[model samples]
Target: DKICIGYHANNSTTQVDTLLEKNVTVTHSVELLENQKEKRFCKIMNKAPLDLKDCTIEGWILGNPKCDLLLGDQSWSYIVERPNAQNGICYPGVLNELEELKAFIGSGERVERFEMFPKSTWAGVDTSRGVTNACPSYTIDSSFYRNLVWIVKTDSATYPVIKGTYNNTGTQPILYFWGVHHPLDTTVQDNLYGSGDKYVRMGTESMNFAKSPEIAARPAVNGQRSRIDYYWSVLRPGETLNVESNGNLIAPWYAYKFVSTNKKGAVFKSDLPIENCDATCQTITGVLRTNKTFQNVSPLWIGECPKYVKSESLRLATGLRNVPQI
Candidate 1:
């Protein structure tokens, strides 16, 4: 019980001792209230709560000399006693997997992330598409986890082509992306695009989030759309598709389009730039068109997001400074 989990300012030796003993990481010059030089902080990585087998800890550690030990919380008092044989099955993999598991059993109560494994094998989930076995699985940020959770919210899915919701994280930007699936076996349109709508969308929000301006909703019109900015990307056999955009976040519209026909339309392409600006026209394949099969209308609300001015002289003449690249 008295394992000296941490120590005091006077006992700096204890700090070093604990780090060496537990094999944990010792951050350099970490400041405690007195933001002076510092002891940095001790990082314990993924550690078990106690000898309470088959048990999961609840709540979280307090912190500092005050929260030095595992003290309170009802989530702590009740540890489930499981069988000895089921020891490492759940919590003994990669560090990220371990961290995700801890979050799952703790206050987050968002265990669906962990449940995604076992079913998602390297054979089924491609590293190039959807989510892999990594913690963020398919992404690198926390909101990405939110999207991941939303995608696999229920059950009965495979290789897991998750439909990312309209993402609005802190201040980075607001964007939307749709998860895509591969032609595992079937050659039908159903297998390719389960939902027909957002074809190949590029999303946007902030080129430099820290120094971005306060955009006012691109001045929307009733039952109509206007020109806005956005960042675009291509989607194909194994891609993570995005479908909504308002450029408020950075890129105005996260665009996408799917082509299925032509001995089964082989590929969809995004060649034209800025031609179909807003949803003024009725051309769905305006931004992107199916190869060989040309189109007329551009099914959109407003014109495309701005393309940055590469020429310094152009920047001087036009006020298009931080416009997203076309």
Candidate 2:
């Protein structure tokens, strides 16, 4: 089965026009936002080809002309790096390691030497200062999407994958799932606050300090949220089966959800809307929601092609493999 996946909410004006102008028939429309015009337009414009390393899959287009667009392909997967604690940066472990190294150096370094030494002198002075290179080097040269994807590949092995199936007659089935295991950043908390209730009320306050003059400081207490990603797969009829990802069996239907925190348990979450399916087509979707919170709030989506259905042995063998290494 052939499947197409693309950004439904994040799109530029030009992208929307491009989709509207395309002659191809749109089989499904995933509404990411309820009533936002721009988001609606974006959902229509973005389209991805349902093929392994398919060239037809269009890459993301940034609205800003100055900003270059990063074309996503089968070789790479997407990751959304969200925040965990209040004012805590997502992927703080990496940053924390770097800070620790900086602190180590700060402890041993002569403040006067750093202030008075010239560039050449500073470079030559190699005292037993704290290790400057404690953590890996980080680059802010990419977009949020690119950075997240990078982190997932480097830190997390089992990245989420989206799969779609289609028959020769133009029938398509698609599925989406992912696993998230990372810390959240302060920025993500801000976004979450905008989405719902704000547990902490100190977002608006400023701090008065002596050495470092900053507008605001992070909250003392930050909540935690579990990480889990999910997606939708549409099955279409008549299109050639284009099973993408590592070679494995493509189940016609399956769904699952697990409580991330207190009530940790996995339940059969998939309940195909058979009633919703018609003689000509069928639409199936799975949803999992929760009210849990945490310091590790990185959400991830994992999509994989199973080896077989109803075979516990096969299912075990179809586990995630070949994590992208940076």
Candidate 3:
């Protein structure tokens, strides 16, 4: 008999159904101007009421981390990383002819480079506990576990914002949501390492860390926190760059995934506060269904569970919705 433990190779298929249904009325509007490009962006807005519930949505526009180089008034090129596979092992590589095209964007001026990493990059930490060519789940001191990081670089010329509505049409009140996911390993027990020198910062960090024990342990002295070192830099008009305000808002770890057992289940909830943008803020709840199977143990007690596995789709619905006032 084979004893299944960590992650199953080919387990039962899981299904998730996401539904975002609401009946409400909202009327609001905002004006956005892109002077450099001679474009004015405007849209009617609606805020999801506090009672909103169960809405399925998908918007990860920056999922691909590649730099876009725009040559003055002529043309632009995009540079990205591609994964190469050899002997069933994968390696990261630059996209086609990207290096050769770099000369166009250079002017003896200091050019800034940026990267983005989503859940897919850090597969082991975000998904299953197993070994793979890309991510291998292992103990550091027979008790401590190391975390993984996914790196993404973007083209300076591209300024992309993730946009989504509760439903396809804009009829029902629209709920605009955007946030970043930074999962920490239990090794870093203190949440303070991720926070800055502010009270709200400490609160946000604390709330975000409380979501996932798998990412951060707890708060430490002086409210210092251990956070994933990364940021989103926005290049404004006239060569000025501004990081998005409120990007530091911390959310709960369970905002990403949940762990459970037949006897007892652990729920991770995001505690980060919403940014005061003119956008609507809402709590989108979803259920993740993961399949489990086990494998045989080796002489060294090493288990061979594949790291890569399909993620249970998020069955999302809207709730706890709010909007920022001007």
Candidate 4:
């Protein structure tokens, strides 16, 4: 059997409910952002050793080897906007693009505070990021962690939650979140951590819920955590869209498709170019690389991906042909 995952495939709750009856699992994963209440995401280069093979940060879109990113189940989202010098240098609840996120990390007040309480020095008591137990207990709410992936800075920062520079050019530093390795066990306390860093990004408006439909910006329940849902399907080996849902599984914003090759691997593909995508196409492609996933396993881009980055050459190299239309 093949597991078909679609991005924003279902439009209404009923469509999702119908899939639930067919033994399809309803899954969700948290894409965290550094915030005042939740500062769970932290840099793990100097403090912790890179324990996982897939944990390394090379070959990613803008992956940085100098700093490896880490996150726990406890997550948060950007609540306010601290634009380029619009407010103070780095406010408590303010987090912007990779540029500002790094600026705050390298030279922010909070970094110093977290740095002072280093997990390296304390050994197991990671007060720096408020992680007493590195691997805490969490239900597998979401199967894929890549949905919340962000480009972070890894310059000189004691506790770099968000690292990387988005040079105002064609190229920028970014990382693609793949299936997490070694799921965290709350029962077993270990030094090893799950990959990916969650940091804040926002616009002029504070607490702007309707700004974007991206799962990350959804409203927080009880001001605690935001729970976003996705439709995951299990199909035949050659199946693409879910036949059970009629054509509801196909959406304009769909990004990645995983077609099972065998138990060990699957065929992944990013859809072709779209017209008048605005900035949606450009932003997603700028941060993804073909080398990161299982050689040829390419995932779709939730937003518009440019032809230049997701080029024909890379697709040919990886043996990823155009996905047959639904």
Best by the TM-score measure: 1
Q: Is candidate 2 or candidate 4 better by TM-score?
A: 2
Please, what is the TM-score per model? 0.17, 0.15, 0.16, 0.14
| Candidate 2: tens digits of C-alpha lDDT, residues 1-326 | 89997433222122111323542222232222111111100000121111111111111110111111222222111111112211112211212233343232222211110011111211111112111111122343222211111111112122123233333232222211111222244444232222222211101012111111111233332122322121122222332333222111111222111111121111111222212111211001221122212111112112221111222111111112222323
Clashes of each: 42, 51, 37, 12
Cα lDDT tens digits for candidate 4, 1-326? 79996453322212112322532222322212111111111111112111112232111111212112322111111111112211111101112243433222222111100111111222221122211111122333211222222111123223223111111121211111111111123211112221233222211111111111112333333232222222221112222221111000111111112211111111111122222212221121122222222211123222222233232222111112123335
State each model's CA lDDT, in order: 0.22, 0.20, 0.20, 0.20
RMSD of 2: 30.6
For model 2, the superposed segments whose C-alpha errors exceed 4 Å read 1-169, 175-192, 195-326
Ranking by TM-score: 1, 3, 2, 4
lDDT of 4 at 136: 20
lDDT of model 3 at residue 284?
17
Looking at model 1, residue 319 earns an lDDT score of 17
Error of 1 at 166 (Å): 5.2
Candidate 3, residues 111-215: lDDT per residue as tens digits? 222222233422212123211222111222111011122222132221122111111121111111122323334332223223222111211211121122234
**Which of 3 and 4 is ahead in TM-score?**
3
RMSD (CA, Å), candidate 3 to true, equals 29.4
lDDT tens string, model 1, 85-175? 1222111112223444343233221111111112232222222232222212113311111221111112223323222223332222111
Candidate 1's displacement at residue 227, Å, is 35
